[PDB]
Amino acid sequence: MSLPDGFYIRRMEEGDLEQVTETLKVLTTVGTITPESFCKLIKYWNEATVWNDKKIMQYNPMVIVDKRTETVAATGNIIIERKIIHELGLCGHIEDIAVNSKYQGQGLGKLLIDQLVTIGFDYGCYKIILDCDEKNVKFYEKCGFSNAGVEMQIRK
Amino acid sequence: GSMSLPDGFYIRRMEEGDLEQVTETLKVLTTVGTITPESFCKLIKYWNEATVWNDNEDKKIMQYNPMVIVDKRTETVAATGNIIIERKIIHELGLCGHIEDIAVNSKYQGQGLGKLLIDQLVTIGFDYGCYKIILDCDEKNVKFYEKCGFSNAGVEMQIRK
Ligand SMILES: CC(C)(COP(=O)(O)OP(=O)(O)OC[C@H]1O[C@@H](n2cnc3c(N)ncnc32)[C@H](O)[C@@H]1OP(=O)(O)O)[C@@H](O)C(=O)NCCC(=O)NCCS
Numbered sequence: 001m002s003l004p005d006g007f008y009i010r011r012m013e014e015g016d017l018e019q020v021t022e023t024l025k026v027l028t029t030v031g032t033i034t035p036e037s038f039c040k041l042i043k044y045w046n047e048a049t050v051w052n053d054k055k056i057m058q059y060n061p062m063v064i065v066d067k068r069t070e071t072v073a074a075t076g077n078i079i080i081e082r083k084i085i086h087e088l089g090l091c092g093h094i095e096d097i098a099v100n101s102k103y104q105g106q107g108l109g110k111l112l113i114d115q116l117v118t119i120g121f122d123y124g125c126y127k128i129i130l131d132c133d134e135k136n137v138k139f140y141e142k143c144g145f146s147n148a149g150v151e152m153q154i155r156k
Numbered sequence: 157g158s159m160s161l162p163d164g165f166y167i168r169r170m171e172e173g174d175l176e177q178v179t180e181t182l183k184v185l186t187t188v189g190t191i192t193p194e195s196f197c198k199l200i201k202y203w204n205e206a207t208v209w210n211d212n213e214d215k216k217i218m219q220y221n222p223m224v225i226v227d228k229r230t231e232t233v234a235a236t237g238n239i240i241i242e243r244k245i246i247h248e249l250g251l252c253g254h255i256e257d258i259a260v261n262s263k264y265q266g267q268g269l270g271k272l273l274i275d276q277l278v279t280i281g282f283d284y285g286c287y288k289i290i291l292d293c294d295e296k297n298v299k300f301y302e303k304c305g306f307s308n309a310g311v312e313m314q315i316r317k
């Protein structure tokens with residue numbers, strides 16, 4: 001599970017605004033975001049912790065960076081939830097996976113999911129889930145995931 | 157902070173004292189296990205204080221919204237469900253609600269209690285300003301959820317420790 005030479009993964013930072021918004025736009029609508037508001041979002045994500053009786057960050061936004069060009073090749077996040085079931089169990093929610101086109105087909109998506117999963121299991125999650133489009137199911141099965149249900153949504 | 161619902165039920169946020177009844181209810185869903193009153197009390201404290209950053213400081217956004225529907229006839233918990241609020245970067249730093257852990261006690265099944273619960277959770281998420289609310293269900297319940305206004309949006313994938 002190591003990244004290809006030249007690429008590294010790290011927690012998303014305030015200075016990533018431009019590259020991250022650009023990357024996420026290939027996934028869905030992003031819209032207008034100011035540096036000021038992004039600053040605020042990053043502080044929230046950097047401070048929210050999950051009660052643990054070892055510090056658990058509720059948000060774990062990652063970026064994989066191609067060091068040569070300082071370009072964000074991909075981004076993904078894993079959100080940690082504490083429940084009552086499974087003896088006050090922890091559940092990880094992988095969200096907002098996006099790999100830039102120029103960087104796909106190189107194994108970076110799988111390595112990103114692998115790193116997110118590791119973050120979750122290291123925190124003690126009894127399970128990690130995510131929702132994907134039917135056309136991405138095979139990629140997720142190759143990351144070790146299995147079909148568990150149907151995602152249902154309702155929009156405002 | 158209680159709200160009456162049709163047919164002699166009312167809804168309210170979960171409390172420390174609901175441990176025994178909530179434990180029994182969630183077993184309808186999956187393993188609950190052993191949970192002490194002190195641990196449960198700490199969980200409730202965490203759930204009552206965790207907020208999602210926002211600018212309407214007049215309406216705090218609770219990260220966790222653990223609800224119980226109590227049967228007035230018996231003053232016992234009939235159902236429980238939660239909606240967890242997540243702040244994203246997409247949709248202009250949008251909010252996504254995640255409905256989780258829906259458990260209706262078996263004596264109440266077939267009474268429309270599930271719908272009542274889901275409808276209240278959705279209201280809670282949209283009142284917070286969520287652009288969408290999602291949940292994962294078994295194939296069997298897709299129809300039930302469609303009766304609640306939800307539509308098939310994708311596939312839930314998991315990996316277990
Ligand atoms: C994340 C995503 C881009 C794939 O990332 P990726 O870096 O291209 O994929 P990887 O190189 O890590 O591939 C891992 C494995 O999954 C397979 N795979 C990737 N995409 C696949 C597809 N569409 N169909 C089938 N298998 C696929 C690869 O062949 C590889 O398997 P192998 O090791 O047996 O060869 C894609 O699966 C996805 O979910 N896209 C939606 C979100 C996003 O990034 N979107 C913009 C799309 S334009």
Ligand SMILES: CC(=O)N[C@@H]1[C@@H](O)[C@H](O)[C@@H](COP(=O)(O)O)O[C@@H]1O
Pocket residue numbers: 027028029094095096097098130131132133246288310
């Ligand atoms: C595994 C993964 O990345 N799933 C994503 C989800 O996290 C993201 O929020 C959403 C955006 O779609 P939306 O704009 O319709 O909400 O797409 C996919 O479901």
Ligand SMILES: CC(=O)N[C@@H]1[C@@H](O)[C@H](O)[C@@H](COP(=O)(O)O)O[C@@H]1O
Pocket residue numbers: 085127149185186187255256257258259291292293294
């Ligand atoms: C809509 C709904 O209620 N979905 C629940 C989910 O929230 C819960 O965590 C899980 C328990 O199953 P588990 O023990 O397999 O985690 O069951 C269902 O998928």
